Amino acid sequence: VDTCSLASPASVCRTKHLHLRCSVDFTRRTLTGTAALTVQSQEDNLRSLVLDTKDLTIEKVVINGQEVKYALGERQSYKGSPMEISLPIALSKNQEIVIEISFETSPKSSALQWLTPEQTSGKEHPYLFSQCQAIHCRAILPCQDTPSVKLTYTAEVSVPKELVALMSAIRDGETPDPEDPSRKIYKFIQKVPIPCYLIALVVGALESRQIGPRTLVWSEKEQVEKSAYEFSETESMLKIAEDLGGPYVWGQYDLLVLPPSFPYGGMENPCLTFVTPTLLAGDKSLSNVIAHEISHSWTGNLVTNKTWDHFWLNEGHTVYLERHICGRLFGEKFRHFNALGGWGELQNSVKTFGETHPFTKLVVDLTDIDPDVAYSSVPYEKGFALLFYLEQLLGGPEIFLGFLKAYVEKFSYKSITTDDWKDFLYSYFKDKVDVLNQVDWNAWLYSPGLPPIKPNYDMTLTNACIALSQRWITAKEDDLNSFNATDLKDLSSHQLNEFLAQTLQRAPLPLGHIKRMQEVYNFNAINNSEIRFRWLRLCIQSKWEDAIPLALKMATEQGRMKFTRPLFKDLAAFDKSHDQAVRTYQEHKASMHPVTAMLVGKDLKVD
Ligand SMILES: [Yb+3]
Ligand SMILES: [Yb+3]
Ligand SMILES: [Yb+3]
Ligand SMILES: [Yb+3]
Ligand SMILES: [Yb+3]
Ligand SMILES: [Yb+3]
Ligand SMILES: [Zn+2]
């Protein structure tokens, strides 16, 4: 059973299809319409069922032309309120009915952010975007809000005609709204069965540019040109991924480049990947995020975690695939560079939560825990570390990629657990059961902290990063004028980034060191969001007062949680900026993304 869901489980009934008819109301900040759910009974004599909801207003439920009885339980925090629906007649096993629920979302739906015109690039129009992973789809529409159920869907969305609607689906046309001359209806169809967390909607002043045979980039006009360039390697990445995982089954692969308050680096919404505009470095160096989202078209979207306890299946395999894409593009030495950097990130998150903290476990029991609170890089990097370790244990990347593709085929269109994965691992590698049996599975899977064994990493591209970092860390005052802009001359931006990551792990540095570093390297002027992020953290943790406005500015002028949360935490920990940080959070809170606002509030202990 999915302990994050209050709905009837898949053993009871299964949603097979959703038809959403809705209208996006910017004045009231509500989605209004009808969710028609085709539900199939898995049990004899089924007379009722329960759906997840969250701050939804139910207008009426209709099954076969007649309204039926329903009730809503008490709100269980982030889990929302269970909705019990009495069926007009009892269903046999495998029998299907269509349940048509009329509803309105609340303006505070945790799935949605409503932007005023001033919160956009163009400043003339409002903007709406959704984000359902993990369990926010219930805040959009009634559903079995669990990844253990997969459904196709169709949608018709009415919006002000000056705007554009897009969804995680194939575009299926547009018409004027028959009921409203100032609106348009955009139609969508998703023919591949998906978990409902992959449902997504955006509505705004969007423009499109074609950058591949199956890829348009969508954004506000201000960001389109930069985006087309930044993500120009998307189709090449797509093709590599198809080599690694088998055919792309989803048809289109479009990119949506959101406004700055989008909470994630990317979200793998099918047919339409969402991405932060903070990826726009100007040199494509952050496009590994694109590789990542692309990889999810197999690991996650095709093979899906059955519950969020097994989220590492989604993220670990995807990062594994992601780094293989980067490796094929730029070389095995680079794959190792990124992999080693991943381990560095794992070190960090483990130090942040603490080595006994439950959230550093690979498999986590999320019964009474908000997935948003448990979210971290642990499932990504401990997950990857496990797979990278197995690769080396079992004969190398060629052999382990054989397993990956077999795994994807085996479980395509299915929802699985960590046990299903490991069972298949053993079945695939049945000839090496004796090596597999030497693995500390219980430590790897269920113990907190760093994993029991570190993989082997090629150091070639990381050495120059380490050397420069160690020079700065061991440098005394009379060494400072020995640093020179020429230190950076033969370093890629990745290497710059890794140098800053290495140095940050040893923060703080003396104020004098930090001030010299700005003098000779001028990271203040760097556009790269990752680099600027680590630099500003280094500055704030080194107590440089001058950096406070820049840090506050980055934390608030964009909203990627990866950046906004640690910057706010760093600012709150620095006495000179503490009250300023908390004050800035509270002035911006109402205009922040709902999830981000919640996490930062918790991070700063503002209640
Ligand atoms: Yb039953
Ligand atoms: Yb029966
Ligand atoms: Yb304003
Ligand atoms: Yb069509
Ligand atoms: Yb098993
Ligand atoms: Yb010296
Ligand atoms: Zn991912």
PDB file of N, CA and C in Angstrom, residues 519-594:
ATOM      1  N   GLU A 519      39.173  39.585  -6.399  1.00  0.00           N
ATOM      2  CA  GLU A 519      40.109  40.476  -7.077  1.00  0.00           C
ATOM      3  C   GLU A 519      40.667  39.812  -8.333  1.00  0.00           C
ATOM      4  N   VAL A 520      41.081  38.559  -8.221  1.00  0.00           N
ATOM      5  CA  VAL A 520      41.754  37.907  -9.336  1.00  0.00           C
ATOM      6  C   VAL A 520      40.842  37.053 -10.236  1.00  0.00           C
ATOM      7  N   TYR A 521      39.732  36.547  -9.705  1.00  0.00           N
ATOM      8  CA  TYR A 521      38.855  35.675 -10.500  1.00  0.00           C
ATOM      9  C   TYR A 521      37.525  36.311 -10.895  1.00  0.00           C
ATOM     10  N   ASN A 522      37.080  37.302 -10.129  1.00  0.00           N
ATOM     11  CA  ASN A 522      35.856  38.048 -10.433  1.00  0.00           C
ATOM     12  C   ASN A 522      34.615  37.162 -10.619  1.00  0.00           C
ATOM     13  N   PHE A 523      34.441  36.191  -9.729  1.00  0.00           N
ATOM     14  CA  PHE A 523      33.280  35.314  -9.783  1.00  0.00           C
ATOM     15  C   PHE A 523      31.981  36.108  -9.623  1.00  0.00           C
ATOM     16  N   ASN A 524      32.067  37.314  -9.065  1.00  0.00           N
ATOM     17  CA  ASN A 524      30.914  38.215  -8.975  1.00  0.00           C
ATOM     18  C   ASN A 524      30.261  38.453 -10.338  1.00  0.00           C
ATOM     19  N   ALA A 525      31.053  38.321 -11.394  1.00  0.00           N
ATOM     20  CA  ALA A 525      30.606  38.646 -12.735  1.00  0.00           C
ATOM     21  C   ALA A 525      30.196  37.409 -13.528  1.00  0.00           C
ATOM     22  N   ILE A 526      30.368  36.232 -12.937  1.00  0.00           N
ATOM     23  CA  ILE A 526      30.046  34.992 -13.640  1.00  0.00           C
ATOM     24  C   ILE A 526      28.530  34.816 -13.812  1.00  0.00           C
ATOM     25  N   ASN A 527      28.104  34.409 -14.996  1.00  0.00           N
ATOM     26  CA  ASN A 527      26.677  34.200 -15.224  1.00  0.00           C
ATOM     27  C   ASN A 527      26.197  32.830 -14.765  1.00  0.00           C
ATOM     28  N   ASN A 528      27.039  31.819 -14.945  1.00  0.00           N
ATOM     29  CA  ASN A 528      26.717  30.449 -14.569  1.00  0.00           C
ATOM     30  C   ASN A 528      26.084  30.388 -13.173  1.00  0.00           C
ATOM     31  N   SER A 529      24.834  29.932 -13.103  1.00  0.00           N
ATOM     32  CA  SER A 529      24.105  29.908 -11.836  1.00  0.00           C
ATOM     33  C   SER A 529      24.745  28.971 -10.802  1.00  0.00           C
ATOM     34  N   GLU A 530      25.238  27.814 -11.229  1.00  0.00           N
ATOM     35  CA  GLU A 530      25.854  26.876 -10.292  1.00  0.00           C
ATOM     36  C   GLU A 530      27.120  27.488  -9.664  1.00  0.00           C
ATOM     37  N   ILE A 531      27.989  28.034 -10.511  1.00  0.00           N
ATOM     38  CA  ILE A 531      29.223  28.700 -10.085  1.00  0.00           C
ATOM     39  C   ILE A 531      28.947  29.892  -9.184  1.00  0.00           C
ATOM     40  N   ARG A 532      28.026  30.751  -9.589  1.00  0.00           N
ATOM     41  CA  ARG A 532      27.697  31.928  -8.792  1.00  0.00           C
ATOM     42  C   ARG A 532      27.141  31.522  -7.429  1.00  0.00           C
ATOM     43  N   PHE A 533      26.292  30.493  -7.439  1.00  0.00           N
ATOM     44  CA  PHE A 533      25.722  29.900  -6.223  1.00  0.00           C
ATOM     45  C   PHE A 533      26.818  29.482  -5.227  1.00  0.00           C
ATOM     46  N   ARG A 534      27.720  28.609  -5.657  1.00  0.00           N
ATOM     47  CA  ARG A 534      28.766  28.154  -4.756  1.00  0.00           C
ATOM     48  C   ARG A 534      29.668  29.308  -4.305  1.00  0.00           C
ATOM     49  N   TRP A 535      29.968  30.234  -5.204  1.00  0.00           N
ATOM     50  CA  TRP A 535      30.784  31.394  -4.857  1.00  0.00           C
ATOM     51  C   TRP A 535      30.146  32.238  -3.758  1.00  0.00           C
ATOM     52  N   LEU A 536      28.852  32.506  -3.901  1.00  0.00           N
ATOM     53  CA  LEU A 536      28.147  33.311  -2.927  1.00  0.00           C
ATOM     54  C   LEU A 536      28.032  32.578  -1.580  1.00  0.00           C
ATOM     55  N   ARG A 537      27.857  31.263  -1.606  1.00  0.00           N
ATOM     56  CA  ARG A 537      27.838  30.497  -0.367  1.00  0.00           C
ATOM     57  C   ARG A 537      29.196  30.629   0.329  1.00  0.00           C
ATOM     58  N   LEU A 538      30.255  30.478  -0.458  1.00  0.00           N
ATOM     59  CA  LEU A 538      31.611  30.593   0.047  1.00  0.00           C
ATOM     60  C   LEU A 538      31.809  31.953   0.709  1.00  0.00           C
ATOM     61  N   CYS A 539      31.342  33.013   0.044  1.00  0.00           N
ATOM     62  CA  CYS A 539      31.432  34.377   0.564  1.00  0.00           C
ATOM     63  C   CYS A 539      30.658  34.564   1.872  1.00  0.00           C
ATOM     64  N   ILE A 540      29.407  34.127   1.884  1.00  0.00           N
ATOM     65  CA  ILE A 540      28.564  34.281   3.058  1.00  0.00           C
ATOM     66  C   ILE A 540      29.081  33.445   4.225  1.00  0.00           C
ATOM     67  N   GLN A 541      29.459  32.200   3.964  1.00  0.00           N
ATOM     68  CA  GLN A 541      30.001  31.341   5.015  1.00  0.00           C
ATOM     69  C   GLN A 541      31.371  31.853   5.474  1.00  0.00           C
ATOM     70  N   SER A 542      32.049  32.634   4.635  1.00  0.00           N
ATOM     71  CA  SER A 542      33.300  33.261   5.050  1.00  0.00           C
ATOM     72  C   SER A 542      33.072  34.640   5.669  1.00  0.00           C
ATOM     73  N   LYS A 543      31.805  34.988   5.876  1.00  0.00           N
ATOM     74  CA  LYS A 543      31.437  36.199   6.608  1.00  0.00           C
ATOM     75  C   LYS A 543      31.789  37.479   5.863  1.00  0.00           C
ATOM     76  N   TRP A 544      31.703  37.454   4.540  1.00  0.00           N
ATOM     77  CA  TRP A 544      31.959  38.668   3.782  1.00  0.00           C
ATOM     78  C   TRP A 544      30.675  39.463   3.669  1.00  0.00           C
ATOM     79  N   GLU A 545      30.617  40.578   4.382  1.00  0.00           N
ATOM     80  CA  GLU A 545      29.414  41.391   4.447  1.00  0.00           C
ATOM     81  C   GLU A 545      28.974  41.893   3.074  1.00  0.00           C
ATOM     82  N   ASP A 546      29.950  42.250   2.234  1.00  0.00           N
ATOM     83  CA  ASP A 546      29.708  42.788   0.897  1.00  0.00           C
ATOM     84  C   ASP A 546      28.886  41.846   0.024  1.00  0.00           C
ATOM     85  N   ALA A 547      28.970  40.552   0.299  1.00  0.00           N
ATOM     86  CA  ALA A 547      28.310  39.552  -0.524  1.00  0.00           C
ATOM     87  C   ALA A 547      26.831  39.394  -0.179  1.00  0.00           C
ATOM     88  N   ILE A 548      26.413  39.974   0.941  1.00  0.00           N
ATOM     89  CA  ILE A 548      25.047  39.785   1.417  1.00  0.00           C
ATOM     90  C   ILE A 548      23.939  40.226   0.435  1.00  0.00           C
ATOM     91  N   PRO A 549      24.043  41.431  -0.153  1.00  0.00           N
ATOM     92  CA  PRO A 549      23.040  41.821  -1.152  1.00  0.00           C
ATOM     93  C   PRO A 549      23.019  40.898  -2.368  1.00  0.00           C
ATOM     94  N   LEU A 550      24.185  40.453  -2.826  1.00  0.00           N
ATOM     95  CA  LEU A 550      24.211  39.542  -3.969  1.00  0.00           C
ATOM     96  C   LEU A 550      23.521  38.225  -3.616  1.00  0.00           C
ATOM     97  N   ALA A 551      23.829  37.707  -2.424  1.00  0.00           N
ATOM     98  CA  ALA A 551      23.268  36.444  -1.947  1.00  0.00           C
ATOM     99  C   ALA A 551      21.753  36.543  -1.796  1.00  0.00           C
ATOM    100  N   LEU A 552      21.295  37.612  -1.153  1.00  0.00           N
ATOM    101  CA  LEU A 552      19.874  37.846  -0.981  1.00  0.00           C
ATOM    102  C   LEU A 552      19.210  37.960  -2.337  1.00  0.00           C
ATOM    103  N   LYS A 553      19.890  38.645  -3.248  1.00  0.00           N
ATOM    104  CA  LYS A 553      19.355  38.874  -4.575  1.00  0.00           C
ATOM    105  C   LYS A 553      19.174  37.544  -5.309  1.00  0.00           C
ATOM    106  N   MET A 554      20.208  36.715  -5.350  1.00  0.00           N
ATOM    107  CA  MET A 554      20.074  35.436  -6.027  1.00  0.00           C
ATOM    108  C   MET A 554      18.989  34.568  -5.386  1.00  0.00           C
ATOM    109  N   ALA A 555      18.958  34.519  -4.060  1.00  0.00           N
ATOM    110  CA  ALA A 555      17.992  33.681  -3.359  1.00  0.00           C
ATOM    111  C   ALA A 555      16.539  34.038  -3.706  1.00  0.00           C
ATOM    112  N   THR A 556      16.284  35.305  -4.021  1.00  0.00           N
ATOM    113  CA  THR A 556      14.919  35.791  -4.238  1.00  0.00           C
ATOM    114  C   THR A 556      14.544  36.065  -5.706  1.00  0.00           C
ATOM    115  N   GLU A 557      15.519  36.390  -6.546  1.00  0.00           N
ATOM    116  CA  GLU A 557      15.192  36.730  -7.920  1.00  0.00           C
ATOM    117  C   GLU A 557      15.037  35.476  -8.769  1.00  0.00           C
ATOM    118  N   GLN A 558      15.439  34.342  -8.220  1.00  0.00           N
ATOM    119  CA  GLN A 558      15.063  33.054  -8.787  1.00  0.00           C
ATOM    120  C   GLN A 558      14.630  32.170  -7.625  1.00  0.00           C
ATOM    121  N   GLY A 559      14.099  30.992  -7.933  1.00  0.00           N
ATOM    122  CA  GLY A 559      13.423  30.198  -6.934  1.00  0.00           C
ATOM    123  C   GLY A 559      13.745  28.722  -6.952  1.00  0.00           C
ATOM    124  N   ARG A 560      14.767  28.341  -7.708  1.00  0.00           N
ATOM    125  CA  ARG A 560      15.208  26.956  -7.708  1.00  0.00           C
ATOM    126  C   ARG A 560      15.612  26.586  -6.283  1.00  0.00           C
ATOM    127  N   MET A 561      14.921  25.601  -5.704  1.00  0.00           N
ATOM    128  CA  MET A 561      15.137  25.239  -4.301  1.00  0.00           C
ATOM    129  C   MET A 561      16.586  24.889  -4.009  1.00  0.00           C
ATOM    130  N   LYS A 562      17.249  24.255  -4.969  1.00  0.00           N
ATOM    131  CA  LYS A 562      18.667  23.932  -4.867  1.00  0.00           C
ATOM    132  C   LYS A 562      19.531  25.143  -4.507  1.00  0.00           C
ATOM    133  N   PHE A 563      19.138  26.312  -4.997  1.00  0.00           N
ATOM    134  CA  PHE A 563      19.883  27.529  -4.722  1.00  0.00           C
ATOM    135  C   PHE A 563      19.256  28.345  -3.587  1.00  0.00           C
ATOM    136  N   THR A 564      17.952  28.567  -3.678  1.00  0.00           N
ATOM    137  CA  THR A 564      17.241  29.423  -2.733  1.00  0.00           C
ATOM    138  C   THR A 564      17.326  28.946  -1.269  1.00  0.00           C
ATOM    139  N   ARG A 565      17.217  27.637  -1.047  1.00  0.00           N
ATOM    140  CA  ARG A 565      17.231  27.102   0.314  1.00  0.00           C
ATOM    141  C   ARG A 565      18.581  27.257   1.025  1.00  0.00           C
ATOM    142  N   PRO A 566      19.677  26.795   0.400  1.00  0.00           N
ATOM    143  CA  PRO A 566      20.990  26.928   1.037  1.00  0.00           C
ATOM    144  C   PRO A 566      21.449  28.385   1.166  1.00  0.00           C
ATOM    145  N   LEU A 567      21.109  29.236   0.205  1.00  0.00           N
ATOM    146  CA  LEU A 567      21.424  30.655   0.337  1.00  0.00           C
ATOM    147  C   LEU A 567      20.689  31.274   1.528  1.00  0.00           C
ATOM    148  N   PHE A 568      19.405  30.979   1.655  1.00  0.00           N
ATOM    149  CA  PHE A 568      18.656  31.457   2.806  1.00  0.00           C
ATOM    150  C   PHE A 568      19.213  30.899   4.121  1.00  0.00           C
ATOM    151  N   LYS A 569      19.564  29.616   4.143  1.00  0.00           N
ATOM    152  CA  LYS A 569      20.142  29.009   5.349  1.00  0.00           C
ATOM    153  C   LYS A 569      21.497  29.650   5.710  1.00  0.00           C
ATOM    154  N   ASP A 570      22.366  29.804   4.716  1.00  0.00           N
ATOM    155  CA  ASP A 570      23.639  30.504   4.869  1.00  0.00           C
ATOM    156  C   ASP A 570      23.465  31.945   5.361  1.00  0.00           C
ATOM    157  N   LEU A 571      22.522  32.676   4.775  1.00  0.00           N
ATOM    158  CA  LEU A 571      22.225  34.027   5.231  1.00  0.00           C
ATOM    159  C   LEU A 571      21.656  34.061   6.658  1.00  0.00           C
ATOM    160  N   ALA A 572      20.842  33.071   7.019  1.00  0.00           N
ATOM    161  CA  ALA A 572      20.283  33.020   8.371  1.00  0.00           C
ATOM    162  C   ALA A 572      21.334  32.683   9.423  1.00  0.00           C
ATOM    163  N   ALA A 573      22.401  32.002   9.018  1.00  0.00           N
ATOM    164  CA  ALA A 573      23.431  31.559   9.956  1.00  0.00           C
ATOM    165  C   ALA A 573      24.490  32.636  10.208  1.00  0.00           C
ATOM    166  N   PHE A 574      24.478  33.668   9.378  1.00  0.00           N
ATOM    167  CA  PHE A 574      25.435  34.766   9.437  1.00  0.00           C
ATOM    168  C   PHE A 574      24.777  35.919  10.183  1.00  0.00           C
ATOM    169  N   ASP A 575      25.291  36.234  11.368  1.00  0.00           N
ATOM    170  CA  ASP A 575      24.671  37.230  12.243  1.00  0.00           C
ATOM    171  C   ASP A 575      24.360  38.553  11.542  1.00  0.00           C
ATOM    172  N   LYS A 576      25.239  38.973  10.642  1.00  0.00           N
ATOM    173  CA  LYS A 576      25.090  40.265   9.975  1.00  0.00           C
ATOM    174  C   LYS A 576      23.898  40.308   9.036  1.00  0.00           C
ATOM    175  N   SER A 577      23.462  39.139   8.571  1.00  0.00           N
ATOM    176  CA  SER A 577      22.409  39.065   7.567  1.00  0.00           C
ATOM    177  C   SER A 577      21.182  38.313   8.048  1.00  0.00           C
ATOM    178  N   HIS A 578      21.213  37.823   9.279  1.00  0.00           N
ATOM    179  CA  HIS A 578      20.149  36.945   9.747  1.00  0.00           C
ATOM    180  C   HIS A 578      18.769  37.586   9.691  1.00  0.00           C
ATOM    181  N   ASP A 579      18.598  38.716  10.367  1.00  0.00           N
ATOM    182  CA  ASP A 579      17.275  39.330  10.454  1.00  0.00           C
ATOM    183  C   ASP A 579      16.839  39.835   9.084  1.00  0.00           C
ATOM    184  N   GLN A 580      17.810  40.264   8.296  1.00  0.00           N
ATOM    185  CA  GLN A 580      17.542  40.720   6.945  1.00  0.00           C
ATOM    186  C   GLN A 580      17.003  39.570   6.091  1.00  0.00           C
ATOM    187  N   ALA A 581      17.597  38.391   6.244  1.00  0.00           N
ATOM    188  CA  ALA A 581      17.164  37.196   5.522  1.00  0.00           C
ATOM    189  C   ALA A 581      15.751  36.777   5.921  1.00  0.00           C
ATOM    190  N   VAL A 582      15.504  36.657   7.221  1.00  0.00           N
ATOM    191  CA  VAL A 582      14.179  36.273   7.677  1.00  0.00           C
ATOM    192  C   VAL A 582      13.155  37.325   7.250  1.00  0.00           C
ATOM    193  N   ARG A 583      13.533  38.597   7.317  1.00  0.00           N
ATOM    194  CA  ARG A 583      12.610  39.658   6.929  1.00  0.00           C
ATOM    195  C   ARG A 583      12.284  39.585   5.442  1.00  0.00           C
ATOM    196  N   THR A 584      13.291  39.282   4.635  1.00  0.00           N
ATOM    197  CA  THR A 584      13.113  39.175   3.193  1.00  0.00           C
ATOM    198  C   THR A 584      12.247  37.978   2.817  1.00  0.00           C
ATOM    199  N   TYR A 585      12.416  36.871   3.539  1.00  0.00           N
ATOM    200  CA  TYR A 585      11.575  35.702   3.333  1.00  0.00           C
ATOM    201  C   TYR A 585      10.108  36.049   3.567  1.00  0.00           C
ATOM    202  N   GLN A 586       9.833  36.781   4.637  1.00  0.00           N
ATOM    203  CA  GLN A 586       8.453  37.051   4.987  1.00  0.00           C
ATOM    204  C   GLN A 586       7.794  38.063   4.056  1.00  0.00           C
ATOM    205  N   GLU A 587       8.569  38.985   3.500  1.00  0.00           N
ATOM    206  CA  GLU A 587       8.021  39.932   2.544  1.00  0.00           C
ATOM    207  C   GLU A 587       7.756  39.270   1.185  1.00  0.00           C
ATOM    208  N   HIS A 588       8.502  38.217   0.874  1.00  0.00           N
ATOM    209  CA  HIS A 588       8.369  37.531  -0.404  1.00  0.00           C
ATOM    210  C   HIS A 588       7.515  36.266  -0.334  1.00  0.00           C
ATOM    211  N   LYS A 589       7.252  35.796   0.883  1.00  0.00           N
ATOM    212  CA  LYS A 589       6.586  34.521   1.100  1.00  0.00           C
ATOM    213  C   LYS A 589       5.313  34.346   0.264  1.00  0.00           C
ATOM    214  N   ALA A 590       4.443  35.346   0.281  1.00  0.00           N
ATOM    215  CA  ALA A 590       3.152  35.243  -0.388  1.00  0.00           C
ATOM    216  C   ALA A 590       3.294  35.107  -1.903  1.00  0.00           C
ATOM    217  N   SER A 591       4.409  35.586  -2.444  1.00  0.00           N
ATOM    218  CA  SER A 591       4.615  35.570  -3.883  1.00  0.00           C
ATOM    219  C   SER A 591       5.562  34.446  -4.309  1.00  0.00           C
ATOM    220  N   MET A 592       5.950  33.612  -3.359  1.00  0.00           N
ATOM    221  CA  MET A 592       6.801  32.476  -3.660  1.00  0.00           C
ATOM    222  C   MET A 592       5.989  31.261  -4.118  1.00  0.00           C
ATOM    223  N   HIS A 593       6.669  30.313  -4.743  1.00  0.00           N
ATOM    224  CA  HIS A 593       6.070  29.029  -5.027  1.00  0.00           C
ATOM    225  C   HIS A 593       5.678  28.398  -3.680  1.00  0.00           C
ATOM    226  N   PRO A 594       4.510  27.742  -3.615  1.00  0.00           N
ATOM    227  CA  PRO A 594       3.990  27.260  -2.327  1.00  0.00           C
ATOM    228  C   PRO A 594       4.892  26.257  -1.612  1.00  0.00           C
TER     229      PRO A 594
END
